[PDB]
Design a protein around this ligand. Structure first.
Ligand SMILES: Nc1ncnc2c1ncn2[C@@H]1O[C@H](COP(=O)(O)OP(=O)(O)O)[C@@H](O)[C@H]1O
Ligand SMILES: Nc1ncnc2c1ncn2[C@@H]1O[C@H](COP(=O)(O)OP(=O)(O)O)[C@@H](O)[C@H]1O
Ligand SMILES: [Mg+2]
Ligand SMILES: [Mg+2]
Lengths: 74, 160, 118, 371, 371
């Protein structure tokens, strides 16, 4: 399925499709605002990835239920 | 238990009309309720309810405890209302899955009937002959030595 | 068998379920707050010069890029495993529920009460 | 809201709301104008009695079916039938209900396009969908494979399906059905003296066919037995007296299904078009189709057909395969029960042909992705 | 941790953890998209069934192998096969397990480089190593010398080895293998009336070949005997009945191995390419290679091949040398057993291509010292 497309998509999200931006080129109050904004966005991303880890555990448990059901069903 | 008493207190009048219609159809005058289970089944089918033949058989085999046919309208009415469907599908399958996830402290894709026993023991509630044995018997109804997820579903599906 | 036993059992199981729901929700809230606090490093309002402001701001920019890449990677992993979970859900559902699909009906409701028509 | 599962059919219109067990209103699809003059004034005589009303005044009407062989030949009468079905037998305005019509396989396109155009312009439904009459009958059996022989009253068609993937190159549609059996019975009754000619008396012959005829397990032995003894002669009382006695016409009328040479048709019987439909399928799904042969439709209600067909197919098929014929007791309404099940599904809820889509592409939308 | 000994092969993917006796999961390597339309809604129909699932629904699929002759011609399908193998047949995430693929000799470089790039980027393994399919089969026999003829299903190759020193100038790779024998059998079955055309029926012909065909000790005598008596005609029941009788097609299908002129190939049979591979070796190790001829691979499982090959080589070889043909009963999984043994060695533990090494030199690392 053209894994080149998958690789380039991942790379673009890694560097281009993500909000990648040089910002430490500003005046004092504005630089403080921008640093706080990026840090808080990244903190929200921390909460998101924590929930991703939690739901990933849940999906792992669901797949365990899947295997147990399949083995018991055959 | 007390749930039956509460249901008696919350007498739904919409079904009360049909149940008193059964009262009239059965009692042909000063009748002390001889309990004609044939008439009981005919009423159950007539009033729009869908009693299983095994349910009517249980009604046949769980009446006339007095021995004289005359059964108090209280206990008979309780039997009739409970044999009538009063439930909403017993919660949701999504709730069942989430709660079973809660219950999988073993984190092994299921729970154990022994684990079930210990968890209900943590509730600090009385376990008796009605309790204890059939709890673990039907929780692991397939008797795998552990309660599977679908076993947990089948244990208490359609019950609130 | 008495259904009063099933009623009492369901009351106890409902209490178990609600207690575990609130307990897990509270634990998750606490863990979430703790993780965010220990990971989202607070910004400081004083003690740093303008040059220090710029230095720490660029440091946080780099850190933001690093952990953003990490969280996007784990998000992609979550997406792929979720696709897999959905596929296996369909697989096991076809394994089990392929027989039960037609069974879903609400039957003989109104037409059984039409004896007065003729 | 709830969906209307209508099923035009040919001979009996079956309709009802989605999610029930049986159709709410079942009535013959005939529209009969009066033919005599009429002398009483103010009697309130209408110009056309449709549906079940014209089966009670049929003595002075000229009943004419608006659907000949699956296809619709008289669009005004069909519109009248639909209007009656919606407004008087169900009493639900169509402005607030999706509809799910049914159509035989291999029918002319213009019929389907005109059907959707009528449903969207005259009755002005929110959304309608057209489904093949055999897939529904497969739904009702709760299967997902199997080859279904849906011998209706207009047309007999035989759609094989495996694992949900229909095989479009193996559909064998044959135009012998209940109506031709009625005509053949009416034609062989003349050998005893009973002559039925009027279009009203076709209904009487249909009643005779329904109540008396049966399919013989072995044809020659029955022909020999009926010609020696008299244990088969069953009598029947006409709508005015003068009982009649049907001899070996009992099993000769429905025998036409297995020997279409009786009414001059060339093709092979319903016992051999099923085997041919199977043999066109791939070599690896023939066992499953052999084991899950499904019967549906009204005309497959003859007493003793599920054994004759099994005997014939077992004669044709290889000796190792197991031949099983599914004949549910609710055969007549199998298509409509399947239609109700399909309309009640959540996954199907986005397949309807929404009205805005029709406004953008015209009636030819039905052949497109929304099939 | 434990290593994953995968073995792509061509026709059967064999995998399992290192250190066992037999592969954990063995399943055909075919990916088949459905080809018909599909009418049942909500049946949960997937877009591609891979592995052993597509050998049960093969009636409505178009199976297509992703590996033609050792080389891989369709990388997306091969990636799908690997993903299935890791996640559903073994249920071990590849992020925590080294892998040991196998590759035929004299294959294109780009195939091997793409294989390692996939394993390192998509599945993200810790370390992978690619080994020649014949050295493993020599491991499994517990020898250290010998010339191994690994007649797989894709390609037949003949690697001579002495005292652990492989002879790169004496590898004779021939592209006749089990698949060409299946096609030739399917082509000669048409001489009795049985026509198999669909890509699904190729599997049926493969089953016929596996269960009935055998290699004749002397070809002309068998051809004469089968043409007079009828003691050879063995019958076989298709997946739907209609048994078939195979006459002298039994030993004519696998005879193609020793006379590749049957399918139009120019080269000499597997009985003479082994002798040529030996004669290219030095004059002092020919006795040891004569005495330790090893057979492996699936296609060398025909009943009676270990005698025909010995007779042929004894005819070719000098009369003094002793010719011995090692044919272990576990021939089919010999390569994988050898792979498990090699992965379980302590001396081999530092030969893996570690991921940091790949990051520094790119996919072309495989041709380098870490072979
Ligand atoms: N009980 C019965 N026995 C024999 N034939 C019947 C019976 N009921 C209906 N039929 C025949 O089947 C026809 C009705 O078929 P039906 O399934 O309603 O057709 P459609 O597919 O158009 O709905 C009638 O014309 C009648 O000839
Ligand atoms: N018992 C058998 N008898 C004859 N031929 C066989 C037998 N088993 C397998 N084969 C042939 O060998 C092939 C499998 O070879 P295999 O060793 O799996 O190839 P690979 O080297 O790709 O793993 C099959 O396609 C089949 O044609
Ligand atoms: Mg029909
Ligand atoms: Mg091999």
């Amino acid at each position: 399925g053209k894994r080149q497309t998958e690789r380039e998509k991942k790379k673009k999200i890694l560097a281009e499709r993500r909000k990648v931006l040089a910002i430490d080129h500003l005046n004092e109050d504005q630089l403080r605002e921008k640093a706080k904004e990026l840090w808080q966005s990244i903190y929200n991303l921390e909460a998101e990835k924590f929930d991703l880890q939690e739901k990933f555990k849940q999906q792992k448990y669901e797949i365990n239920v899947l295997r147990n059901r399949i083995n018991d069903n055959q | 238990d007390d749930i039956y008493k509460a249901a008696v207190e919350q007498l739904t009048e919409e079904q009360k009309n049909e149940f008193k219609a059964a009262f009239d159809i059965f009692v042909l005058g000063a009748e002390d309720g001889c309990i004609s289970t044939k008439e009981l089944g005919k009423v159950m089918r007539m009033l729009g309810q869908n009693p299983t033949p095994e349910e009517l058989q249980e009604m046949i085999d769980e009446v006339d405890e007095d021995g004289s046919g005359t059964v108090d309208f209280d206990e008979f009415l309780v039997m009739m209302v409970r044999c009538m469907k009063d439930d909403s599908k017993g919660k949701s399958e999504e709730e069942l899955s989430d709660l079973f996830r809660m219950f999988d402290k073993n984190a092994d894709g299921y729970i154990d009937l022994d684990e079930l026993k210990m968890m209900l023991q943590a509730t600090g509630e009385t376990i008796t002959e009605d309790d204890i044995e059939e709890l673990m018997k039907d929780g692991d109804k397939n008797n795998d030595g552990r309660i599977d997820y679908d076993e947990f579903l089948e244990f208490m599906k359609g019950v609130e | 068998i008495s259904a009063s036993r099933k009623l009492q059992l369901k009351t106890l199981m409902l209490q178990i379920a609600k207690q575990e729901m609130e307990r897990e929700a509270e634990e998750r809230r606490g863990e979430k707050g703790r993780v965010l606090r220990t990971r989202c490093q607070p910004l400081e309002l004083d003690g740093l010069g303008f040059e220090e402001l710029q230095d720490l701001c660029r440091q946080l920019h780099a850190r933001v890029d690093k952990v953003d890449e990490e969280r996007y990677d784990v998000e992609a992993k979550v997406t792929k495993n979720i696709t897999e979970i959905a596929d296996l859900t369909q697989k096991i559902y076809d394994l089990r529920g392929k027989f039960k699909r037609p069974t879903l009906r609400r039957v003989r409701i109104s037409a059984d009460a039409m004896m007065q028509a003729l | 809201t709830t969906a209307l599962v209508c099923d035009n059919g040919s001979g009996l219109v079956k309709a009802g709301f989605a999610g029930d067990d049986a159709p709410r209103a079942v009535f013959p699809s005939i529209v009969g104008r009066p033919r005599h003059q009429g002398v009483m004034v103010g009697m309130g005589q209408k110009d056309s009695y449709v549906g079940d009303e014209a089966q009670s005044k049929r003595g002075i009407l000229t009943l004419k079916y608006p659907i000949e062989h699956g296809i619709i030949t008289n669009w005004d009468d069909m519109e009248k039938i639909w209007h009656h079905t919606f407004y008087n037998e169900l009493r639900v305005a169509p402005e607030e209900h999706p509809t799910l019509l049914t159509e035989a396989p291999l029918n002319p396109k213009a019929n389907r396009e005109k059907m959707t155009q009528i449903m969207f312009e005259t009755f002005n439904v929110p959304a309608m969908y057209v489904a093949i009459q055999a897939v529904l009958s497969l739904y009702a059996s709760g299967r997902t494979t199997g080859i279904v022989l849906d011998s209706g009253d207009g047309v007999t068609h035989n759609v094989p399906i495996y694992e949900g993937y229909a095989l479009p190159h193996a559909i064998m549609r044959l135009d012998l059905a209940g109506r031709d059996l009625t005509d053949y019975l009416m034609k062989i009754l003349t050998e005893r003296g009973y002559s039925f000619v009027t279009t009203a008396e076709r209904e009487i012959v249909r009643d005779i066919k329904e109540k008396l005829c049966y399919v013989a397990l072995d044809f020659e032995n029955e022909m020999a037995t009926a010609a020696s003894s008299s244990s088969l002669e069953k009598s029947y009382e006409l709508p005015d007296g003068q009982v009649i006695t049907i001899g070996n016409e009992r099993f000769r009328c429905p025998e036409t299904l297995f020997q279409p040479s009786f009414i001059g048709m060339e093709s092979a019987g319903i016992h051999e078009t099923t085997y041919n439909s199977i043999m066109k399928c791939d070599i690896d799904i023939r066992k499953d189709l052999y084991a899950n042969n499904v019967l549906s439709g009204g005309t497959t209600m003859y007493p003793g057909i599920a054994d004759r067909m099994q005997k014939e197919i077992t004669a044709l098929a290889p000796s190792t395969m197991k031949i099983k014929i599914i004949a549910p007791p609710e055969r007549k309404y199998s298509v409509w029960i399947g239609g109700s099940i399909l309309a009640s599904l959540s996954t199907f809820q986005q397949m309807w042909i929404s009205k805005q889509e029709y406004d953008e592409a015209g009636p030819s939308i039905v052949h497109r992705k929304c099939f």
